[PDB]
């Protein structure tokens, strides 16, 4: 049982995916606002609002993020040619989602040091099908649940480590959960 929902709502691109629709409720609200509640420590999901295509933009977000277990709050997106999947992790629960990636330095932006990581996913699901693509991570040390993200500063930092970003695909402020519980209401602009 899977469910994937995308489109434009309140003037913003939205995306929601889960492999357990019965334990996760995603709600589109006005403008760049969305809410997500998940319970029962069952299922995997990723959802949020943003843009398609993305860009080197300043992403402002605010709201409430109340995970209970494995979960993260991140700017998340893709580029094409080359195919790249990227995470700017602003907050997370009991697991660092960067786990297993290779350390690749630091960048200081938006009031905190971010630890950079790179990783390769081999024959894994992607926006273009099963592919081998590169991953970039920036993980904020000073966890937060509201503020501004200078995506271009991360894009520049990543380009000094490995291949530069390609043509932007979608770009969202994502809430994620993996067999856990929580609630969140966020607003992007």
């Amino acid at each position: 049982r899977t469910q994937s929902s995308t489109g434009t709502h309140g003037g913003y691109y939205y995306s929601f995916w889960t492999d357990n629709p019965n334990t996760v409720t995603y709600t589109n609200q006005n403008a760049g606002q969305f809410s997500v509640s998940w319970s029962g420590n069952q299922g995997n999901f990723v959802g949020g609002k943003g843009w398609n295509p993305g860009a080197a933009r300043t992403i402002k977000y605010s709201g409430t993020y109340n995970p209970n277990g494995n979960s993260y709050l991140a700017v998340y997106g893709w580029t094409r040619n080359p195919l790249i999947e990227y995470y700017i992790v602003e907050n997370f629960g009991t697991y660092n989602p960067s786990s297993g990636a290779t350390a690749a330095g630091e960048v200081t932006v938006d009031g905190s040091v971010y630890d950079i990581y790179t990783s390769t996913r081999t024959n894994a699901p992607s926006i273009e099908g099963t592919r081998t693509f590169q991953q970039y991570w920036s993980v904020r040390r000073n966890k937060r649940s509201s503020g501004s993200v200078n995506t271009g500063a991360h894009f520049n930092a990543w380009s000094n480590v490995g291949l530069a970003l390609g043509s932007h695909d979608y770009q969202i402020l994502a809430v994620e959960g993996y067999y856990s519980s929580g609630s969140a209401t966020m607003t992007v602009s």
Side-chain angles (χ1 to χ4, degrees):
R1 192 93 129 85
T2 78
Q3 161 159 330
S4 179
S5 290
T6 73
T8 310
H9 181 278
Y12 288 83
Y13 179 81
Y14 76 86
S15 178
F16 176 68
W17 174 94
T18 181
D19 57 27
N20 195 329
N22 285 126
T23 60
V24 187
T25 300
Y26 175 94
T27 308
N28 273 333
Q29 301 167 294
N30 281 127
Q33 189 177 317
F34 66 96
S35 290
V36 71
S37 76
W38 67 108
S39 66
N41 302 329
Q42 273 293 309
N44 175 9
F45 78 89
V46 184
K49 272 187 170 185
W51 299 262
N52 194 355
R57 52 155 43 79
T58 290
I59 296 176
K60 302 156 82 83
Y61 69 97
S62 78
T64 295
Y65 175 62
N66 192 27
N68 184 45
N70 198 352
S71 171
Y72 64 67
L73 176 72
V75 183
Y76 171 74
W78 290 80
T79 74
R80 300 180 189 251
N81 295 124
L83 193 59
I84 287 159
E85 185 197 25
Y86 68 82
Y87 302 79
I88 300 163
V89 179
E90 293 293 271
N91 202 332
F92 54 99
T94 61
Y95 296 69
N96 189 326
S98 90
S99 296
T102 309
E106 298 173 6
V107 60
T108 303
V109 54
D110 295 316
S112 179
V113 168
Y114 287 75
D115 288 302
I116 298 165
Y117 307 84
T118 61
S119 189
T120 306
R121 305 253 289 121
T122 292
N123 302 115
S126 98
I127 55 168
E128 282 175 354
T130 317
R131 300 287 172 82
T132 296
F133 56 93
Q134 290 289 118
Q135 283 191 323
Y136 282 123
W137 304 77
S138 282
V139 178
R140 201 188 170 87
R141 295 194 177 156
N142 293 353
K143 294 184 178 169
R144 64 176 177 171
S145 289
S146 289
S148 286
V149 176
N150 183 342
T151 61
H154 294 269
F155 299 167
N156 290 354
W158 299 338
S159 75
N160 293 323
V161 178
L163 29 46
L165 293 201
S167 301
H168 284 279
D169 204 87
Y170 68 84
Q171 177 181 70
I172 62 174
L173 181 78
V175 179
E176 183 264 9
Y178 190 88
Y179 287 77
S180 67
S181 70
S183 93
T185 294
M186 288 285 154
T187 300
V188 309
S189 62

